[PDB]
Amino acid sequence: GLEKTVKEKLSFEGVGIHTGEYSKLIIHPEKEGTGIRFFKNGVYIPARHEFVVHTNHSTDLGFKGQRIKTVEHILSVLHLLEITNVTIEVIGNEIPILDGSGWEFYEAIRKNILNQNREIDYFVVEEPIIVEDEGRLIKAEPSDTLEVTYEGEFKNFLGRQKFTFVEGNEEEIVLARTFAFDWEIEHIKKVGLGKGGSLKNTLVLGKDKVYNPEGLRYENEPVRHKVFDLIGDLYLLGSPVKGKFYSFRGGHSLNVKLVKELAKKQK
Amino acid sequence: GLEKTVKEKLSFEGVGIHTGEYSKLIIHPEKEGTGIRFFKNGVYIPARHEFVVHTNHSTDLGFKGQRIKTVEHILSVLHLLEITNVTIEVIGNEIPILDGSGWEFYEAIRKNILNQNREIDYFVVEEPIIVEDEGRLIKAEPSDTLEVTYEGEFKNFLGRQKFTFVEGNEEEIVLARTFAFDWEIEHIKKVGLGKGGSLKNTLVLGKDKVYNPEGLRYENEPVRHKVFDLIGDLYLLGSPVKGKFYSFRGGHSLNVKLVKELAKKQK
Ligand SMILES: CCCCCCCCCCCCCCCC(=O)O
Numbered sequence: 001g002l003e004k005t006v007k008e009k010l011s012f013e014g015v016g017i018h019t020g021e022y023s024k025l026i027i028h029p030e031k032e033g034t035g036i037r038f039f040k041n042g043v044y045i046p047a048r049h050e051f052v053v054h055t056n057h058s059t060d061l062g063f064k065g066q067r068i069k070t071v072e073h074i075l076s077v078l079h080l081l082e083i084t085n086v087t088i089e090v091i092g093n094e095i096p097i098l099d100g101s102g103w104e105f106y107e108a109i110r111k112n113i114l115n116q117n118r119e120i121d122y123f124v125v126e127e128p129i130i131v132e133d134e135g136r137l138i139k140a141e142p143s144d145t146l147e148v149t150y151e152g153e154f155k156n157f158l159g160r161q162k163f164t165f166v167e168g169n170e171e172e173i174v175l176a177r178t179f180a181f182d183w184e185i186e187h188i189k190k191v192g193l194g195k196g197g198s199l200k201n202t203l204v205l206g207k208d209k210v211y212n213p214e215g216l217r218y219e220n221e222p223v224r225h226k227v228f229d230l231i232g233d234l235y236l237l238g239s240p241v242k243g244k245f246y247s248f249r250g251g252h253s254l255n256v257k258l259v260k261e262l263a264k265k266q267k
Numbered sequence: 268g269l270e271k272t273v274k275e276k277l278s279f280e281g282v283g284i285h286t287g288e289y290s291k292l293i294i295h296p297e298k299e300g301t302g303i304r305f306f307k308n309g310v311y312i313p314a315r316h317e318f319v320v321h322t323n324h325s326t327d328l329g330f331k332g333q334r335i336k337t338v339e340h341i342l343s344v345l346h347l348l349e350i351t352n353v354t355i356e357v358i359g360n361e362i363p364i365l366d367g368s369g370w371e372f373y374e375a376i377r378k379n380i381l382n383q384n385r386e387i388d389y390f391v392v393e394e395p396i397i398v399e400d401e402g403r404l405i406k407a408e409p410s411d412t413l414e415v416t417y418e419g420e421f422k423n424f425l426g427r428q429k430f431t432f433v434e435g436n437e438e439e440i441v442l443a444r445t446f447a448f449d450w451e452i453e454h455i456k457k458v459g460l461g462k463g464g465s466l467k468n469t470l471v472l473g474k475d476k477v478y479n480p481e482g483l484r485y486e487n488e489p490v491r492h493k494v495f496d497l498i499g500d501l502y503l504l505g506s507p508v509k510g511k512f513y514s515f516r517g518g519h520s521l522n523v524k525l526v527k528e529l530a531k532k533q534k
């Protein structure tokens with residue numbers, strides 16, 4: 001495919017899920033070969049693993065004293081839409097959570113796609129690789145297309161389920177929201193996070209119930225989101241990816257680990 | 268004591284806990300002998316049991332097609348401060364929840380109290396009375412002062428605790444917030460309520476944990492609030508009350524029941 005970018009400036013705004021603070025986005029179009037980079041306080045931060053400063057319950061980036069929290073969703077969509085050259089201006093400290101999924105971005109970015117005369121130089125996974133971290137494991141091998149599978153071993157009623165994304169199936173995961181278990185909320189708030197969380201932006205699961213009155217969108221909405229997450233994380237390799245990934249009980253932390261140990265192979 | 272009222276117009280505003288909608292309050296001063304009555308869409312609704320239309324997880328009042336949800340807190344404070352003649356203008360369908368306690372009202376009403384030349388005609392409990400409703404029971408006997416005790420048999424870590432309010436101890440309960448356990452937030456949202464609830468306005472308790480990061484104000488904050496509730500409910504007798512009340516596992520529903528079966532004795 002050819003490198004892409006937005007037709008014109010696009011903006012989004014809302015509360016950040018962790019900071020609980022308001023922030024605004026302004027996606028700027030960029031010349032070819034530019035790449036994805038955020039812009040905060042006159043400082044450009046590249047959507048590349050080198051600038052990852054936090055992978056707890058979000059993937060945060062930073063440079064020269066400027067930090068942006070939760071870039072996974074915005075990046076994931078840009079990765080799905082194969083938008084390669086743009087500048088994400090952030091007026092705050094974290095990309096807005098919106099409805100908890102990548103739906104709003106997708107729906108708006110998709111419209112304003114602008115083709116360009118330059119064949120995308122994809123990041124190809126050249127050979128098998130694995131990464132562990134206590135039960136948690138991710139396996140990535142070579143593939144003609146982008147294919148990602150996530151398998152969960154949920155302690156609650158969800159049980160063991162897994163989902164698989166393949167090119168042409170974006171609309172199947174850009175709608176999955178963010179989730180957390182109830183035995184998953186005190187801790188988060190205590191370590192100073194989720195200040196913006198609510199049933200309107202987050203999907204809360206009980207030991208065997210769903211708090212949100214709106215129920216689950218998909219039987220396996222959680223697993224889907226995790227796949228969405230991984231994709232966006234993977235975009236930190238600096239360009240659309242092409243490989244076959246298997247993630248069992250993954251998380252941003254391990255996600256990044258892979259990415260780093262996957263680029264450290266000068267690939 | 269003498270009948271009281273506010274020095275001048277006082278107003279409050281915020282989200283309603285159940286409706287999730289915005290609403291505004293405007294407490295108007297009223298001539299002597301007026302009483303407590305709400306004012307909605309050019310319709311006056313008396314703070315009297317006759318106009319109670321709902322006692323689920325709030326005490327709602329209504330008349331000629333006009334309804335106000337959650338009047339207990341506002342009434343409870345007015346009852347504690349012995350403010351007898353005022354008009355509560357409501358622009359919406361429910362008194363604002365504010366921080367979940369009667370703190371804000373108290374602190375603001377207390378300032379603007381205006382004495383009047385007219386001895387309050389208290390509602391005296393003349394003789395013993397009891398009301399049941401499956402395990403739940405309230406006992407009310409005669410007393411020189413206002414004395415209310417609430418005892419809980421909480422299924423979670425709280426266990427069995429009780430609190431007792433006596434005249435001169437208002438500041439001990441006007442600060443207790445509203446509470447709910449994790450088990451049924453679902454239920455509440457499903458039966459169309461708590462649309463405004465959040466950890467900022469509600470104190471959520473787990474099977475053995477406290478979600479709110481701000482912890483409990485008082486070891487027994489819940490039981491206290493229940494006492495606050497009862498007091499405000501009791502003010503639906505149409506005038507400050509003087510009796511000794513015992514409530515074991517009570518709730519607005521039973522509260523009102525008592526009040527009704529307590530006034531039905533032409534007392
Ligand atoms: C109104 C009720 C509220 C409860 C608020 C939920 C607390 C927020 C928890 C944050 C989710 C953590 C998981 C991170 C996943 C992601 O990257 O989206």
Ligand SMILES: CCCCCCCCCCCCCCCC(=O)O
Pocket residue numbers: 204211284324325326339445446447452455460461462463464465466469471496
């Ligand atoms: C994860 C959970 C969410 C936060 C939302 C809380 C749900 C709203 C609960 C409404 C409280 C009802 C009981 C209080 C009655 C009163 O104040 O008189």
